[PDB]
């Protein structure tokens, strides 16, 4: 058993007191007022972050811990923010999102975000049962919590078997995907797998919750992968009893207009 097996119990165990003040306690989060009332009025001309998720890939980005260009796809891409993103980036020429949509999941949001008009999106879609396709770079921030870590890591491991396709089909492609539950030993073994033929490495970033143990997996990096979920977990085990509350920034506005 790991130390992040260990941070799973903790957090299973924290009254709901103690689990709401843990779960923001040192992390970023950016300040949605404005863009969660354009979104929920059913504005189209915004271009304000469409979900919390655009900041995440922006500050992987500006790291320099991925690589966006060319023709990109978005697995999983929900509202769309990791879309959109991409979408926005020069180097980009064009993206594929697919999300499955329906019953308790999102669908995407629809909105003139610059580069708009270079986004294909399908909702509908399994991303597990589609065949690959040509693409430069793959995306997928595919990982629901639950507070049964074994359906983590069996959800995890789903997510890097696709990525294994995804790269069988475009073994030179940039890839950056959702690793949601880094430290359980089956997810340990086919990260090993992945890292030993594609490279890479993991990173964790600010804005998320520390209610959730996931990590970034990127093959612009590099990197121990134990040694890393293993920084995490301590990361993640010491803010229990912090008191200092969440860090609120500005939330992207990536702007309007097509490419
Ligand atoms: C609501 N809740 C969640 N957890 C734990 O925190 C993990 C994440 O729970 P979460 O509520 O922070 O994320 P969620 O599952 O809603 O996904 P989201 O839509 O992206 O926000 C769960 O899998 C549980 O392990 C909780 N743990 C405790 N102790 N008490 C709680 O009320 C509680
Ligand atoms: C957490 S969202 C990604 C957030 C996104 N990156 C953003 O910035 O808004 C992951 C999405 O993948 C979708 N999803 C889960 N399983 C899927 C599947 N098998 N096929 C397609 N989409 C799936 C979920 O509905 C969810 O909307
Ligand atoms: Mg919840």
Same mark, same amino acid.
């Given at each position: 058993?790991?130390?992040?097996?260990?941070?799973?119990?903790?957090?299973?165990?924290?009254?709901?007191?103690?689990?709401?003040?843990?779960?923001?306690?040192?992390?970023? *989060?950016? /300040? $949605?007022?404005?863009?969660?009332? =354009? @979104?929920?009025?059913?504005?189209? !001309?915004?271009?304000?972050?469409? #979900?919390?998720?655009?900041?995440?890939?922006?500050?992987?980005?500006?790291?320099?811990?991925?690589?966006?260009?060319?023709?990109?796809?978005?697995?999983?891409?929900?509202?769309?923010?990791?879309?959109?993103?991409?979408?926005?980036?020069?180097?980009?020429?064009?993206?594929?999102?697919?999300?499955?949509?329906?019953?308790?999941?999102?669908?995407?949001?629809?909105?003139?975000?610059?580069?708009?008009?270079?986004?294909?999106?399908?909702?509908?879609?399994?991303?597990?049962?589609?065949?690959?396709?040509?693409?430069?770079?793959?995306?997928?921030?595919?990982?629901?919590?639950?507070?049964?870590?074994?359906? *983590?890591? /069996? $959800?995890?491991?789903?997510?890097? =078997? @696709?990525?294994?396709?995804?790269? !069988?089909?475009?073994?030179?492609? #940039?890839?950056?995907?959702?690793?949601?539950?880094?430290?359980?030993?089956?997810?340990?073994?086919?990260?090993?797998?992945?890292?030993?033929?594609?490279?890479?490495?993991?990173?964790?970033?600010?804005?998320?919750?520390?209610?959730?143990?996931?990590?970034?997996?990127?093959?612009?990096?590099?990197?121990?992968?134990?040694?890393?979920?293993?920084?995490?977990?301590?990361?993640?085990?010491?803010?229990?009893?912090?008191?200092?509350?969440?860090?609120?920034?500005?939330?992207?506005?990536?702007?309007?207009?097509?490419?």
């Amino acid at each position: 058993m790991t130390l992040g097996d260990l941070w799973k119990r903790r957090l299973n165990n924290c009254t709901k007191e103690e689990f709401f003040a843990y779960r923001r306690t040192g992390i970023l *989060e950016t /300040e $949605r007022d404005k863009a969660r009332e =354009l @979104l929920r009025k059913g504005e189209t !001309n915004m271009g304000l972050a469409v #979900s919390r998720g655009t900041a995440k890939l922006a500050w992987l980005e500006e790291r320099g811990y991925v690589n966006l260009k060319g023709e990109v796809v978005d697995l999983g891409c929900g509202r769309g923010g990791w879309s959109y993103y991409a979408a926005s980036r020069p180097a980009v020429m064009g993206v594929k999102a697919y999300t499955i949509g329906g019953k308790g999941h999102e669908a995407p949001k629809m909105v003139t975000s610059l580069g708009w008009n270079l986004i294909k999106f399908r909702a509908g879609m399994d991303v597990f049962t589609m065949q690959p396709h040509r693409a430069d770079t793959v995306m997928c921030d595919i990982g629901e919590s639950s507070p049964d870590a074994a359906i *983590e890591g /069996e $959800r995890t491991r789903k997510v890097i =078997l @696709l990525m294994e396709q995804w790269k !069988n089909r475009n073994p030179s492609a #940039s890839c950056v995907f959702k690793v949601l539950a880094p430290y359980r030993p089956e997810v340990i073994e086919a990260l090993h797998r992945f890292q030993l033929q594609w490279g890479g490495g993991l990173v964790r970033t600010p804005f998320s919750r520390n209610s959730t143990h996931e990590m970034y997996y990127s093959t612009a990096i590099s990197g121990n992968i134990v040694n890393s979920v293993n920084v995490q977990s301590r990361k993640l085990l010491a803010r229990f009893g912090d008191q200092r509350g969440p860090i609120r920034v500005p939330e992207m506005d990536l702007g309007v207009g097509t490419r």
